[PDB]
Amino acid sequence: SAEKLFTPLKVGAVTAPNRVFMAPLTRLRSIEPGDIPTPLMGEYYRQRASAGLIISEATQISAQAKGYAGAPGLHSPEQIAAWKKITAGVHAEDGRIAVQLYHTGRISHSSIQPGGQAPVSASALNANTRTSLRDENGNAIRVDTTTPRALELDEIPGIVNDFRQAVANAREAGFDLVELHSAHGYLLHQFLSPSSNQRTDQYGGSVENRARLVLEVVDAVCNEWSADRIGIRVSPIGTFQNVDNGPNEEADALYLIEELAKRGIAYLHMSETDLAGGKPYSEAFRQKVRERFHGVIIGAGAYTAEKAEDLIGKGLIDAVAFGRDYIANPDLVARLQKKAELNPQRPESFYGGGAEGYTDYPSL
Ligand SMILES: Cc1cc2nc3c(=O)[nH]c(=O)nc-3n(C[C@H](O)[C@H](O)[C@H](O)COP(=O)(O)O)c2cc1C
Ligand SMILES: O=[N+]([O-])c1cc([N+](=O)[O-])c(O)c([N+](=O)[O-])c1
Numbered sequence: 001s002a003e004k005l006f007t008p009l010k011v012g013a014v015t016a017p018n019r020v021f022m023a024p025l026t027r028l029r030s031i032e033p034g035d036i037p038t039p040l041m042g043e044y045y046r047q048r049a050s051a052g053l054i055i056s057e058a059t060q061i062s063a064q065a066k067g068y069a070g071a072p073g074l075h076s077p078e079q080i081a082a083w084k085k086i087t088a089g090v091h092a093e094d095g096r097i098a099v100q101l102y103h104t105g106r107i108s109h110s111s112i113q114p115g116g117q118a119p120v121s122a123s124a125l126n127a128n129t130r131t132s133l134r135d136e137n138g139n140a141i142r143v144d145t146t147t148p149r150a151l152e153l154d155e156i157p158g159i160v161n162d163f164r165q166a167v168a169n170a171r172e173a174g175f176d177l178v179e180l181h182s183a184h185g186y187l188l189h190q191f192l193s194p195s196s197n198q199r200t201d202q203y204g205g206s207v208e209n210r211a212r213l214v215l216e217v218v219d220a221v222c223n224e225w226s227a228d229r230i231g232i233r234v235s236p237i238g239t240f241q242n243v244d245n246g247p248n249e250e251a252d253a254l255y256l257i258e259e260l261a262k263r264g265i266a267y268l269h270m271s272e273t274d275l276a277g278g279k280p281y282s283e284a285f286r287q288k289v290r291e292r293f294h295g296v297i298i299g300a301g302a303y304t305a306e307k308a309e310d311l312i313g314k315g316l317i318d319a320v321a322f323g324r325d326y327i328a329n330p331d332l333v334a335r336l337q338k339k340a341e342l343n344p345q346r347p348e349s350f351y352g353g354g355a356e357g358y359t360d361y362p363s364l
Contacts, residue, residue: 002309003309004019004309004312004313005018005019005020005305005308005309005312005320005336005337006018006019006020006333006337007019009052009296009318009319010296011052011053011096011177011231011266011267011296011319012177012226012227012228012229012230012231012265012266012267012295012296013176013177013226013228013229013266014053014096014176014177016052016053016096016319017052018051018052018333019052019308019312019318019319019320020051020052020308020319020320020322020332020333020336021051021052021053021054021055021298021319021320021321021322022048022051022053022054022055022321022322022323022326022332023055023300023321023322023323023326024055024056024057024058024100024179024181024233024321024323025057025323025326025327025350026057026058026068026071026351027041027044027057027070027327027350027351027352027358028068028069028070028071028132028140028351028352029041029070029352029353029354029358030070030071030072032069032070032134034076034078034079035060035066035071035072035073035076035079036072036076036078036079036082037072037079037082037083037085037086038082039085040354040355040358040359041072041086042085042086042089043089043359044330044358044359045086045089045090045097046089046090046092046093046095047330047331047359047363048095048326048330048332049089049090049092049093049094049095049097050093050095050330050331050332050333050334051095051096051326051332051333052096052319052333053096053097053098053176053177053319054090054095054096054097054098055097055098055100055179055269055321056097056098056099056100056175057071057072057100058071058100058101058102058104058181058186059071059072059073059074059099059100059101059102059166060072060073060074060075060102060103060104061073061074061075061101061102061103061162061163061165061166062075062103062162062166063075063113063114064103064113064114064119064120064162065102065103065104065162065187066104066108066112066113067102067104067107067108067112067119067131067186068104068108068112068131068132068133069112069132069133069134069140070132070134070140070351070352074099074101074166074169074170074173075162075165075166075169079169080169080172080173083099083170083173083174083175084172084173084174087173087174087175087176088174091174096176096177097175097176098175098176098177098178098179098231099170099173099175099177099178099179100178100179100181100233101163101166101167101170101178101179101180101181102180102181102186102187102188103159103162103163103186103187103188104119104131104186104187105119105120105121105122105148105186105187105190106119106120106121106125106126106127106145106147106148106187106190106196107119107127107129107131107145107185107186107241108131108145108146108148109131109133109143109145109146110146111133112133113146117149118146118147118148118149119145119146119148119149120148120149120150120151120155120187121148121149121150121151121187121190121196122150122151122187122190122191122196122197122198122199122203122204123148123150123196123197123198123199123204124147124148124149124150125147125148125196125198126145126146126147126148127145127148127185127196127241127242127243128145128242129144129145129185129241129242130142130143130144130145131143131145132351132352134352138352139352139353140351140352140353150199153201153203156203156213156216159187159213159217160213160216160217160220161220163180163217163220163221164217164220164221164223164224166178167220167221167224167225167230168224168225170225171225171229176229177229177230177231177266177267178221178225178229178230178231179231179232179233179267179269180214180217180218180221180230180231180232180233181233182214182232182233182234183233183234183235183236183240183271184233184235184240184241184243184271185240185241185242185243188213188214188217189234189235189240189243190243191203191204191210191211191212191213191214192210192211192214192236192245192252192256193210193243193244193245193246194210194246194247195243195244195245195246196243197210207248207251207252207255207256208255210252211252211255211256211259214232214256215259215260218230218232218260218263218265219263222263222265227263227264227265227266228264228265228266229266230263230265230266231265231266231267231268231269231296231298232260232265232267232268232269233269233270233271234253234256234257234268234269234270234271235270235271235272235274236249236252236253236256236270237249237250237253237272237278237279237281237285238272238273238274238278238279239274239278240271240274241274250285253289254288254289254292257289257292257293258292260293261292261293261294261295264294264295265295266295266296267295267296267297267298268289268293268295268296268297268298269297269298269300269321270289270297270298270299270300270317271300271301272299272300272301273301273302274301278301283314283316286311286316286317287316289316290315290316296318296319297316297317297318297319298317298318298319298320298321299311299317299319299320299321300320300321300322300323303320303321303322305336307320308320324345324347324350325342327345327350327361328342328343328344328345328346328361329342329343329361330361330362330363331363331364334363334364335364338364340364343361343362
């Protein structure tokens with residue numbers, strides 16, 4: 001009964017009524033062709049609209065940005081039109097929704113790239129992981145990633161412009177905020193990490209060079225919309241989908257966070273550990289982050305409500321994003337508030353398929 005989870009929080013331009021956020025969750029149920037959000041997706045999001053803030057599944061900024069069969073995009077008219085329905089449905093329920101925008105870079109497969117060609121990255125190094133394709137029956141299948149081509153220097157302004165344009169499209173589509181996906185070994189993170197970035201131009205080497213692209217993107221989208229509409233997800237300590245953060249991860253993380261603070265953006269979303277686990281954040285490191293960033297800090301990664309209360313109470317974070325508990329509990333806020341039991345998770349239906357394991361987890 002004590003409790004800060006159920007108190008309001010100003011998040012840039014909007015106000016969440018509680019601190020229980022829905023983490024971005026790739027579910028691979030979009031229509032192909034066209035990578036189009038669906039009415040079923042609308043329903044799923046509408047069921048969860050009691051969240052303080054919903055953060056959408058990763059959404060491609062361009063066709064080249066596509067990594068997964070069934071992931072949606074936000075570049076085409078049909079995508080914009082479908083997303084508008086989805087956000088209206090969330091708003092119909094007095095919810096708020098951020099779109100997570102990404103470019104997958106090297107976590108992709110030639111068969112879903114334009115012209116069937118190699119995906120792009122900082123450097124020509126395979127991700128050494130799998131993405132998800134669809135088979136002949138439309139079912140999700142995990143397949144090894146295709147080796148990428150290194151971006152040419154003269155292609156980089158295009159990538160920045162695709163982010164900027166996607167953010168314009170997000171504003172039109174009715175999202176409340178945008179979250180740039182600079183985590184989890186996707187394109188922005190592929191530049192940030194020395195493991196994935198062997199460039200010798202101004203986009204690789206030093207931490208200032210490795211953070212250049214993400215900071216260009218931040219600046220571009222701040223300019224396009226408003227800094228109080230922009231959040232960012234980072235995963236800068238540990239290893240995430242085979243991408244570590246190099247041999248100076250803490251100092252490099254703090255450099256990036258100082259840079260982001262200067263832009264006055266709505267929020268910093270920290271993905272603390274990979275689904276396969278990692279070492280917990282020290283409170284010392286939490287305090288170093290806190291003093292470097294003056295907006296909202298969202299924590300994520302196998303959180304319990306207790307851990308969330310403990311850390312908000314300590315003044316170290318403002319909110320928590322829950323992932324898998326959100327898949328299985330559309331009314332998670334109510335269940336956490338009432339200390340109800342949660343629905344059991346069905347991980348076999350996290351990716352692909354239809355309504356089963358998607359919209360069929362009941363509320364109280
Ligand atoms: C099915 C699944 C899909 C995910 N998709 C994304 C994604 O789209 N973007 C992202 O940044 N993280 C993604 N994640 C990570 C979640 O946002 C979250 O950080 C993770 O599940 C850890 O929190 P949890 O223990 O509360 O589930 C995904 C996780 C799972 C289980
Ligand atoms: O498996 N997945 O399909 C998946 C997808 C995304 N994403 O943004 O496209 C992630 O960030 C994560 N993630 O790292 O947790 C997983």
